[PDB]
Amino acid sequence: KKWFSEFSIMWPGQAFSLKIKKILYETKSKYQNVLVFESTTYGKVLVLDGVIQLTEKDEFAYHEMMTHVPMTVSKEPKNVLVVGGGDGGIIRELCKYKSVENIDICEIDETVIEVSKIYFKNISCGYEDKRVNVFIEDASKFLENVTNTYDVIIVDSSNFYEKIYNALKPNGYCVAQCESLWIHVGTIKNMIGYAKKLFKKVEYANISIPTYPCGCIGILCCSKTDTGLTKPNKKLESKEFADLKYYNYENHSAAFKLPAFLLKEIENI
Amino acid sequence: KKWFSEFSIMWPGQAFSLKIKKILYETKSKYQNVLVFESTTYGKVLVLDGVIQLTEKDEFAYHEMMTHVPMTVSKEPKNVLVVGGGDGGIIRELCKYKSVENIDICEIDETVIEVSKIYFKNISCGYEDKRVNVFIEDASKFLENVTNTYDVIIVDSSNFYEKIYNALKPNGYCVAQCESLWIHVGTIKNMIGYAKKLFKKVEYANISIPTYPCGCIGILCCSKTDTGLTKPNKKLESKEFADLKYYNYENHSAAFKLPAFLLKEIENI
């Protein structure tokens, strides 16, 4: 058998590898290289530009935390926007909420959506939901052009934050993927720096997920209210949320309790 | 340059790799292969039987959490035992407490201790402390033979738990390294199973550490009291603890807030 290996100048000096059971699909889209494979122990894997986007084994950690954090804080969210997230995982998580009336997603590369609809049916199933509307578009162009404002914006990717701010309702929230605390602390500082210019409450949380570099990924959290995103305003008690595998009431708050070295870094910002 | 790669049947299908700046030392001791190298981005690395034991970049996460969890719960700990932990990291953390009168460590393989004294001076520095006593011995033999009982036992390695129980004071605590929740859940269930036979409060916590498989490692926590190990009984406010980099009052409790799928597994135990 053969091994997939993940290298990048964003994390030099380290790599993470998964054994390939069999390659399933492979292409060069207009935007990036796309690879799909069955791994031997992590299920199916989606790779974009040689970097793991998701695996079946652990994707719930990232998609549940990214979604249910802001969605339990938002009181009655009606209009939600996903930026990036062609795979549909966040969308699967959003559809669980009955009060949501619309879900927009802006993903630049439709191959990602199409590949995920084909190979990852337990991830991309929210696309069959009538509330969902897909926009094959540059997020920066979508945000400049949009007429609705949103209750929650989830940035599942990677002046921009000026656009996010203007696209949110006066009490709206944004959560964006934001680096591993183990590798890019200067970047975490910069992102928090930018967001604090605009948002009155910027907070950083951490997700345990083995197939992202360093085994974790952070969530930049932006509120317009004084209150912020650390305390849920509801429990996910209905039948739709019975099968959640990572997120729960308590770990919501826990995820914001950061290593001392990080607190020390993000204090004088 | 060349790459070190970490394979094992304990986590098949995955591997983690670090770029080698230069190999520093390499031997086959009576017990295991020992490798030391400077990596390009994680500092010096200690490898035992081809599995990473520690790196300079992130070792504090594991050593601080393993130590300061039970040591902030124990009221006035006087006698402490480390099993394994030849590297000295836990010992460095223990020496910070002024009330501790003795620190015993039982490590079967003195090469580990000697190599760490040479190559990892900011890790093995607690050995120069007068309270520390080294026992080149099999832990199971040490525990059967010991006449003192201990306030805290820290198992920095990997009937045994019957021996740990008997070696602890009536109100003593044990913390043992206990698997990643991402890979060996059956094992976590078994360890908790064994410990609950003996200890009245068994609890599992999670440490974020990038160079262990899956980027995290758990702490099996065993108390004889009803109270347990989730709530510190003190704050580490003195000059000795000013330089802590991971552990703090809040993340102590947070580390016990586990992913829903794990709670579901360890409930009917």
Coordinates of C-alpha atoms in Angstrom, one line a residue:
Chain A
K1 CA 0.0 0.0 0.0
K2 CA 1.0 3.7 -0.3
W3 CA 1.0 6.8 2.0
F4 CA -0.4 10.3 1.6
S5 CA 1.9 12.9 3.1
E6 CA 1.0 16.5 4.1
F7 CA 3.7 19.2 3.7
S8 CA 3.5 23.0 3.8
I9 CA 5.5 26.1 4.4
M10 CA 2.8 27.1 6.8
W11 CA 4.1 24.4 9.1
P12 CA 7.6 23.6 8.1
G13 CA 9.6 20.9 9.8
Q14 CA 6.6 18.6 10.4
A15 CA 4.3 16.4 8.3
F16 CA 1.3 14.1 9.0
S17 CA 0.6 11.0 6.9
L18 CA -2.3 8.7 6.3
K19 CA -2.1 5.2 4.7
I20 CA -4.0 5.0 1.4
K21 CA -6.4 2.1 1.0
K22 CA -7.3 3.4 -2.5
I23 CA -7.4 6.6 -4.5
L24 CA -11.0 7.5 -5.5
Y25 CA -10.8 10.6 -7.6
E26 CA -8.2 13.2 -8.6
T27 CA -8.4 16.5 -10.6
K28 CA -7.0 20.0 -11.2
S29 CA -9.9 22.4 -10.9
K30 CA -9.7 26.0 -12.0
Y31 CA -8.7 26.9 -8.5
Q32 CA -6.8 23.9 -6.9
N33 CA -5.8 20.3 -7.0
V34 CA -8.4 18.0 -5.6
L35 CA -7.7 14.5 -4.3
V36 CA -10.1 12.0 -2.7
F37 CA -9.0 8.7 -1.2
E38 CA -10.2 6.0 1.2
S39 CA -7.6 5.9 4.0
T40 CA -7.2 2.7 6.0
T41 CA -8.2 4.1 9.4
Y42 CA -9.7 7.6 8.9
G43 CA -12.4 6.8 6.3
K44 CA -12.6 8.9 3.2
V45 CA -10.2 11.9 3.0
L46 CA -10.6 15.1 0.9
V47 CA -7.3 16.8 0.0
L48 CA -7.0 20.3 -1.5
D49 CA -3.7 21.6 -2.8
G50 CA -2.1 18.7 -0.9
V51 CA -3.6 19.8 2.4
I52 CA -6.2 17.7 4.2
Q53 CA -9.6 19.4 4.2
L54 CA -11.5 16.7 6.1
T55 CA -11.7 13.1 6.9
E56 CA -14.8 11.1 7.8
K57 CA -13.4 10.0 11.2
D58 CA -13.0 13.4 12.8
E59 CA -14.8 16.1 10.7
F60 CA -17.6 16.3 13.2
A61 CA -15.3 18.0 15.8
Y62 CA -14.6 20.9 13.5
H63 CA -18.1 21.2 12.0
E64 CA -20.0 20.9 15.3
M65 CA -17.8 23.4 17.2
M66 CA -17.8 26.0 14.3
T67 CA -21.6 25.8 14.0
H68 CA -23.1 25.1 17.4
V69 CA -20.9 27.6 19.2
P70 CA -22.5 30.7 17.5
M71 CA -25.8 29.0 16.9
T72 CA -26.4 28.4 20.6
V73 CA -25.5 32.0 21.4
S74 CA -27.6 33.6 18.7
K75 CA -31.2 33.8 20.1
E76 CA -33.4 33.3 17.1
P77 CA -31.1 33.0 14.0
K78 CA -33.1 33.2 10.7
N79 CA -30.5 33.9 8.1
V80 CA -27.1 32.2 8.1
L81 CA -24.1 32.5 5.7
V82 CA -21.3 30.0 5.2
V83 CA -18.2 31.3 3.5
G84 CA -16.1 28.4 2.0
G85 CA -17.2 25.0 3.3
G86 CA -18.0 23.6 -0.1
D87 CA -17.9 20.2 1.6
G88 CA -21.3 20.9 3.3
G89 CA -20.3 19.9 6.8
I90 CA -21.3 23.2 8.4
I91 CA -24.5 23.2 6.3
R92 CA -25.3 19.6 7.7
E93 CA -25.0 21.1 11.2
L94 CA -27.1 24.3 10.4
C95 CA -30.1 22.3 9.0
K96 CA -30.6 20.8 12.4
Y97 CA -32.0 24.1 13.6
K98 CA -35.8 24.5 12.8
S99 CA -35.9 28.3 13.3
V100 CA -33.3 28.8 10.5
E101 CA -35.2 30.1 7.4
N102 CA -32.3 30.4 5.0
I103 CA -28.8 29.2 4.6
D104 CA -26.5 30.8 2.0
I105 CA -23.1 29.4 1.1
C106 CA -20.5 31.2 -1.0
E107 CA -17.8 28.8 -2.3
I108 CA -15.5 29.9 -5.2
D109 CA -14.9 26.3 -6.5
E110 CA -17.9 24.2 -7.4
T111 CA -15.7 21.1 -7.9
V112 CA -15.4 20.9 -4.1
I113 CA -19.2 21.0 -3.7
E114 CA -19.7 18.4 -6.6
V115 CA -17.0 16.0 -5.3
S116 CA -18.4 16.2 -1.8
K117 CA -21.9 15.5 -3.1
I118 CA -20.6 12.4 -4.7
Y119 CA -18.0 10.9 -2.3
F120 CA -19.1 12.2 1.1
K121 CA -22.8 11.7 1.3
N122 CA -23.0 11.9 5.1
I123 CA -21.3 15.3 5.0
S124 CA -23.0 16.9 2.0
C125 CA -26.5 15.9 2.8
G126 CA -27.7 19.4 3.9
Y127 CA -27.5 20.4 0.2
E128 CA -30.8 18.6 -0.4
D129 CA -32.4 21.0 2.1
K130 CA -34.7 23.5 0.6
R131 CA -33.5 26.4 2.7
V132 CA -29.9 26.1 1.3
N133 CA -28.7 28.5 -1.5
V134 CA -25.4 28.0 -3.3
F135 CA -23.3 30.8 -4.8
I136 CA -20.3 29.9 -6.9
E137 CA -18.5 33.1 -6.1
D138 CA -15.6 35.0 -4.6
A139 CA -16.5 35.7 -0.9
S140 CA -15.2 39.2 -1.1
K141 CA -17.4 39.9 -4.1
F142 CA -20.4 38.1 -2.5
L143 CA -20.0 40.2 0.7
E144 CA -19.7 43.5 -1.2
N145 CA -22.8 42.6 -3.3
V146 CA -25.2 41.0 -0.8
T147 CA -28.4 42.9 0.2
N148 CA -29.5 40.8 3.1
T149 CA -27.7 41.0 6.4
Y150 CA -27.1 37.7 8.4
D151 CA -27.6 36.5 12.0
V152 CA -24.5 34.4 11.8
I153 CA -21.6 34.2 9.4
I154 CA -19.4 31.2 9.6
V155 CA -16.1 31.4 7.7
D156 CA -15.0 27.9 6.9
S157 CA -11.9 28.9 4.9
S158 CA -8.2 29.1 5.0
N159 CA -11.3 45.1 4.8
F160 CA -12.6 41.5 4.7
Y161 CA -13.8 41.9 8.3
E162 CA -15.3 45.3 7.5
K163 CA -17.4 43.5 4.9
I164 CA -18.3 40.7 7.5
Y165 CA -19.3 43.4 10.0
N166 CA -21.6 45.2 7.5
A167 CA -23.1 41.9 6.4
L168 CA -24.2 41.0 10.0
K169 CA -27.3 42.3 11.8
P170 CA -26.6 44.8 14.6
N171 CA -26.5 41.9 17.1
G172 CA -25.0 39.3 14.7
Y173 CA -22.0 36.9 15.2
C174 CA -19.1 35.7 13.1
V175 CA -16.9 32.7 13.7
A176 CA -13.8 32.1 11.4
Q177 CA -11.3 29.3 11.2
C178 CA -8.1 30.8 12.8
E179 CA -4.9 28.8 13.0
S180 CA -3.4 26.3 15.4
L181 CA -2.1 27.9 18.7
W182 CA 0.9 25.6 18.4
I183 CA 2.2 27.1 15.1
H184 CA 0.9 30.6 14.1
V185 CA 0.6 32.8 17.2
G186 CA 1.6 36.0 15.4
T187 CA -1.2 35.3 13.0
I188 CA -3.7 34.8 15.8
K189 CA -2.5 38.1 17.2
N190 CA -3.0 39.8 13.9
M191 CA -6.5 38.4 13.3
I192 CA -7.6 39.3 16.8
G193 CA -6.0 42.8 16.1
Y194 CA -8.0 43.3 12.9
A195 CA -11.3 42.1 14.4
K196 CA -11.0 44.3 17.6
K197 CA -10.9 47.4 15.3
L198 CA -14.5 46.5 14.3
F199 CA -16.0 44.1 16.8
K200 CA -16.6 44.9 20.4
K201 CA -15.9 41.3 21.6
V202 CA -13.2 39.2 20.0
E203 CA -12.5 35.7 21.5
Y204 CA -10.5 32.7 20.5
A205 CA -11.5 29.0 21.1
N206 CA -9.7 25.7 20.3
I207 CA -10.9 22.5 18.7
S208 CA -9.2 19.1 19.1
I209 CA -9.0 17.6 15.6
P210 CA -6.2 15.1 14.8
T211 CA -6.0 15.6 11.0
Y212 CA -5.4 19.3 11.2
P213 CA -1.7 20.3 11.7
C214 CA -0.7 20.0 15.4
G215 CA -4.0 18.2 16.1
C216 CA -6.1 21.3 16.8
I217 CA -7.6 24.4 15.1
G218 CA -8.9 27.7 16.5
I219 CA -12.1 29.6 16.1
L220 CA -11.9 33.4 15.9
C221 CA -15.1 34.6 17.5
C222 CA -16.5 38.1 16.8
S223 CA -19.6 39.7 18.5
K224 CA -21.0 43.2 18.1
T225 CA -22.7 42.9 21.6
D226 CA -20.7 43.3 24.9
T227 CA -21.7 39.7 25.8
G228 CA -19.6 37.5 23.4
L229 CA -19.6 33.9 22.3
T230 CA -18.4 31.8 25.4
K231 CA -21.8 31.1 26.9
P232 CA -24.6 29.2 25.1
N233 CA -28.1 30.7 25.5
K234 CA -29.7 27.3 24.9
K235 CA -29.3 23.6 25.2
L236 CA -29.5 21.4 22.1
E237 CA -32.2 19.1 23.5
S238 CA -34.3 18.2 20.4
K239 CA -34.2 15.0 18.4
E240 CA -32.1 16.7 15.6
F241 CA -29.2 17.0 18.0
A242 CA -29.3 13.6 19.7
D243 CA -26.5 12.3 17.4
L244 CA -24.0 15.1 18.1
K245 CA -20.5 13.6 18.7
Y246 CA -18.3 16.4 20.1
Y247 CA -20.1 19.6 21.0
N248 CA -22.0 19.8 24.2
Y249 CA -23.1 22.5 26.6
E250 CA -20.0 22.3 28.8
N251 CA -17.3 21.9 26.2
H252 CA -18.7 25.1 24.5
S253 CA -17.3 27.2 27.4
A254 CA -14.3 24.9 27.9
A255 CA -13.0 25.5 24.4
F256 CA -12.3 29.1 25.3
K257 CA -10.0 28.2 28.2
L258 CA -6.6 28.6 26.5
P259 CA -3.0 27.6 27.4
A260 CA -1.3 30.2 29.5
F261 CA 1.3 31.0 26.9
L262 CA -1.5 32.1 24.5
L263 CA -3.3 34.2 27.0
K264 CA 0.0 36.0 27.6
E265 CA 0.4 36.7 23.9
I266 CA -3.1 37.9 23.3
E267 CA -3.5 40.2 26.3
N268 CA -1.7 43.5 25.3
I269 CA -3.5 43.4 21.9
Chain B
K1 CA 18.2 17.3 5.1
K2 CA 16.4 14.1 6.4
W3 CA 13.1 13.3 8.2
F4 CA 12.3 11.3 11.3
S5 CA 9.0 9.4 11.0
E6 CA 6.9 7.9 13.7
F7 CA 5.1 4.6 13.0
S8 CA 3.3 2.1 15.3
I9 CA 0.7 -0.6 15.4
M10 CA -0.9 1.4 18.3
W11 CA -2.0 3.9 15.7
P12 CA -1.9 2.2 12.3
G13 CA -2.7 4.1 9.2
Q14 CA -1.1 7.4 10.4
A15 CA 2.3 8.8 11.0
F16 CA 3.9 12.1 12.1
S17 CA 7.2 13.4 10.9
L18 CA 9.8 16.0 12.0
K19 CA 12.6 17.3 9.9
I20 CA 16.0 16.5 11.3
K21 CA 18.5 19.3 11.6
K22 CA 21.1 16.9 13.1
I23 CA 21.3 13.6 14.9
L24 CA 22.9 14.2 18.4
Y25 CA 23.1 10.7 20.0
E26 CA 21.9 7.2 19.3
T27 CA 22.1 3.8 21.3
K28 CA 20.5 0.5 22.1
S29 CA 20.1 0.4 25.8
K30 CA 19.3 -2.8 27.8
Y31 CA 15.6 -1.8 27.4
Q32 CA 15.0 0.2 24.2
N33 CA 16.5 2.1 21.3
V34 CA 17.3 5.7 22.2
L35 CA 17.6 8.5 19.7
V36 CA 18.2 12.2 20.2
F37 CA 18.1 14.8 17.5
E38 CA 17.8 18.5 16.9
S39 CA 14.7 19.0 14.8
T40 CA 14.4 22.2 12.6
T41 CA 11.3 23.6 14.4
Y42 CA 10.5 21.6 17.6
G43 CA 14.0 21.9 19.2
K44 CA 15.6 18.8 20.6
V45 CA 13.6 15.5 20.3
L46 CA 13.9 12.4 22.4
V47 CA 12.8 9.2 20.7
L48 CA 12.4 5.8 22.4
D49 CA 11.8 2.6 20.4
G50 CA 11.0 5.0 17.4
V51 CA 8.2 6.8 19.3
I52 CA 8.6 10.5 20.3
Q53 CA 9.0 10.9 24.1
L54 CA 9.3 14.6 24.1
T55 CA 10.3 17.7 22.3
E56 CA 11.5 21.0 23.7
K57 CA 8.8 23.0 21.9
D58 CA 5.7 21.5 23.6
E59 CA 6.8 19.2 26.5
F60 CA 5.6 21.8 29.1
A61 CA 1.9 21.0 28.1
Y62 CA 2.2 17.4 29.2
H63 CA 4.5 18.0 32.2
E64 CA 2.6 20.9 33.6
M65 CA -0.9 19.3 33.3
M66 CA 0.3 15.9 34.7
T67 CA 1.9 17.6 37.7
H68 CA -0.1 20.7 38.6
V69 CA -3.5 19.0 38.2
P70 CA -3.0 16.6 41.2
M71 CA -0.6 19.0 43.0
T72 CA -3.2 21.8 43.2
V73 CA -5.8 19.3 44.5
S74 CA -3.6 17.7 47.2
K75 CA -3.7 20.1 50.2
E76 CA -0.3 19.7 51.7
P77 CA 1.7 17.1 49.6
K78 CA 4.9 16.0 51.3
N79 CA 5.9 12.8 49.6
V80 CA 5.6 12.4 45.8
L81 CA 6.4 9.5 43.5
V82 CA 7.0 9.6 39.7
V83 CA 6.8 6.3 37.9
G84 CA 8.7 6.5 34.5
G85 CA 9.5 10.0 33.5
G86 CA 13.3 9.5 33.3
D87 CA 13.5 12.7 31.3
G88 CA 12.9 14.7 34.5
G89 CA 10.1 17.0 33.2
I90 CA 7.6 16.1 35.9
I91 CA 10.3 16.4 38.5
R92 CA 11.1 19.9 37.2
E93 CA 7.5 20.8 37.9
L94 CA 7.3 19.2 41.3
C95 CA 10.4 21.0 42.7
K96 CA 8.4 24.3 42.3
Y97 CA 6.4 23.3 45.3
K98 CA 8.1 24.3 48.6
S99 CA 6.0 22.1 50.8
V100 CA 7.2 18.9 49.1
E101 CA 9.8 17.2 51.2
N102 CA 10.7 14.3 49.1
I103 CA 10.4 13.3 45.4
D104 CA 11.0 9.6 44.5
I105 CA 11.3 8.5 40.9
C106 CA 11.3 4.9 39.7
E107 CA 12.7 4.6 36.1
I108 CA 13.8 1.1 34.8
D109 CA 16.3 2.5 32.2
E110 CA 19.0 4.8 33.5
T111 CA 20.2 5.7 29.9
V112 CA 17.0 7.8 29.6
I113 CA 17.9 9.7 32.8
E114 CA 21.6 10.1 31.7
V115 CA 20.7 11.2 28.1
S116 CA 18.2 13.7 29.4
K117 CA 20.7 15.0 31.9
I118 CA 23.1 15.6 29.0
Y119 CA 21.0 16.8 26.1
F120 CA 17.9 18.3 27.8
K121 CA 19.2 20.5 30.6
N122 CA 16.1 22.7 30.9
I123 CA 14.1 19.5 31.4
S124 CA 16.3 17.4 33.6
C125 CA 17.3 20.2 36.0
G126 CA 15.1 19.0 38.9
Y127 CA 17.6 16.2 39.4
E128 CA 20.1 18.6 41.0
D129 CA 17.4 19.2 43.7
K130 CA 18.3 17.6 47.1
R131 CA 14.8 16.2 47.7
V132 CA 14.9 14.0 44.6
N133 CA 15.7 10.3 44.9
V134 CA 16.3 8.0 41.9
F135 CA 15.5 4.3 41.8
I136 CA 16.7 2.4 38.7
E137 CA 14.0 -0.3 39.1
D138 CA 10.9 -2.0 37.7
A139 CA 7.9 0.1 38.9
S140 CA 6.0 -3.1 39.8
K141 CA 8.9 -4.2 42.0
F142 CA 9.4 -0.7 43.5
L143 CA 5.6 -0.5 44.4
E144 CA 5.6 -4.0 46.0
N145 CA 8.7 -3.1 48.0
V146 CA 8.2 0.5 49.1
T147 CA 7.6 1.2 52.8
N148 CA 6.5 4.9 52.6
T149 CA 3.1 5.7 51.2
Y150 CA 2.7 8.8 48.9
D151 CA 0.5 11.9 48.7
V152 CA 0.6 11.8 45.0
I153 CA 1.8 9.3 42.4
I154 CA 2.3 10.4 38.9
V155 CA 2.6 7.6 36.3
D156 CA 4.6 9.1 33.4
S157 CA 4.7 5.9 31.4
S158 CA 3.3 4.0 28.4
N159 CA -2.9 -5.5 40.1
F160 CA -0.7 -2.5 39.1
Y161 CA -3.5 -0.2 40.3
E162 CA -3.9 -2.3 43.5
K163 CA -0.2 -1.5 44.2
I164 CA -0.7 2.2 43.4
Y165 CA -3.7 2.3 45.8
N166 CA -1.7 0.7 48.6
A167 CA 1.2 3.0 48.0
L168 CA -1.0 6.1 48.4
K169 CA -2.1 7.8 51.7
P170 CA -5.8 7.3 52.6
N171 CA -6.5 10.7 50.9
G172 CA -3.8 10.4 48.1
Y173 CA -4.1 10.9 44.3
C174 CA -2.8 9.2 41.2
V175 CA -2.6 10.6 37.7
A176 CA -1.5 8.2 34.9
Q177 CA -0.9 8.8 31.2
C178 CA -3.9 7.3 29.4
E179 CA -4.2 7.3 25.6
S180 CA -5.6 9.6 23.0
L181 CA -9.4 9.8 22.9
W182 CA -9.1 9.9 19.1
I183 CA -7.5 6.3 18.9
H184 CA -7.9 4.0 21.9
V185 CA -11.3 4.4 23.4
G186 CA -11.7 0.7 24.4
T187 CA -8.4 1.1 26.3
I188 CA -9.7 4.2 28.0
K189 CA -12.8 2.2 29.0
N190 CA -10.6 -0.6 30.4
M191 CA -8.3 1.6 32.4
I192 CA -11.3 3.5 33.9
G193 CA -12.8 0.0 34.5
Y194 CA -9.8 -1.2 36.5
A195 CA -9.4 2.0 38.5
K196 CA -13.1 2.1 39.5
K197 CA -12.7 -1.3 41.2
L198 CA -10.3 0.4 43.6
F199 CA -10.7 4.2 43.5
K200 CA -13.9 5.9 44.5
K201 CA -13.5 8.7 41.9
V202 CA -12.0 8.0 38.4
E203 CA -11.9 10.9 36.0
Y204 CA -10.4 11.5 32.5
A205 CA -8.8 14.8 31.3
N206 CA -7.2 15.7 28.0
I207 CA -4.0 17.6 27.1
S208 CA -3.3 19.3 23.8
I209 CA 0.2 18.3 22.7
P210 CA 1.1 18.2 19.0
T211 CA 3.9 15.7 19.1
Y212 CA 1.8 12.9 20.7
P213 CA -0.3 10.8 18.2
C214 CA -3.5 12.7 17.3
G215 CA -2.2 15.9 19.0
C216 CA -3.5 15.0 22.4
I217 CA -3.0 12.7 25.4
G218 CA -5.3 11.9 28.3
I219 CA -4.7 11.8 32.1
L220 CA -6.4 9.0 34.0
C221 CA -7.2 10.6 37.4
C222 CA -7.8 8.4 40.5
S223 CA -8.9 9.8 44.0
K224 CA -9.7 7.8 47.1
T225 CA -11.9 10.7 48.4
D226 CA -15.5 11.4 47.0
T227 CA -14.2 14.8 45.8
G228 CA -11.9 14.0 42.8
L229 CA -9.4 15.9 40.7
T230 CA -11.4 18.5 38.6
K231 CA -11.2 21.4 41.0
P232 CA -7.9 23.0 42.2
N233 CA -7.7 23.8 45.9
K234 CA -5.1 26.5 45.4
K235 CA -3.8 29.0 42.9
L236 CA -0.1 28.8 41.8
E237 CA 0.6 32.4 42.7
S238 CA 4.3 32.3 43.9
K239 CA 7.4 33.3 42.0
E240 CA 8.2 29.6 41.2
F241 CA 5.1 29.4 39.0
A242 CA 5.4 32.7 37.2
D243 CA 6.9 31.0 34.1
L244 CA 4.2 28.3 33.6
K245 CA 3.2 28.1 29.9
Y246 CA 0.1 25.9 29.7
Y247 CA -1.5 25.1 33.1
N248 CA -3.7 27.7 34.8
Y249 CA -6.5 27.7 37.2
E250 CA -9.2 27.7 34.6
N251 CA -7.8 25.2 32.1
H252 CA -7.4 22.7 35.0
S253 CA -11.2 22.3 35.1
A254 CA -11.6 22.7 31.3
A255 CA -9.4 19.7 30.5
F256 CA -12.1 17.4 32.1
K257 CA -14.8 18.6 29.6
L258 CA -14.7 15.8 27.1
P259 CA -16.1 15.3 23.6
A260 CA -19.7 14.0 23.7
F261 CA -18.7 10.7 22.0
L262 CA -16.3 10.0 24.8
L263 CA -18.7 10.8 27.6
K264 CA -21.2 8.4 25.8
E265 CA -18.6 5.7 25.9
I266 CA -17.5 6.0 29.5
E267 CA -20.9 6.4 31.1
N268 CA -22.2 2.8 31.5
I269 CA -18.7 1.8 32.9

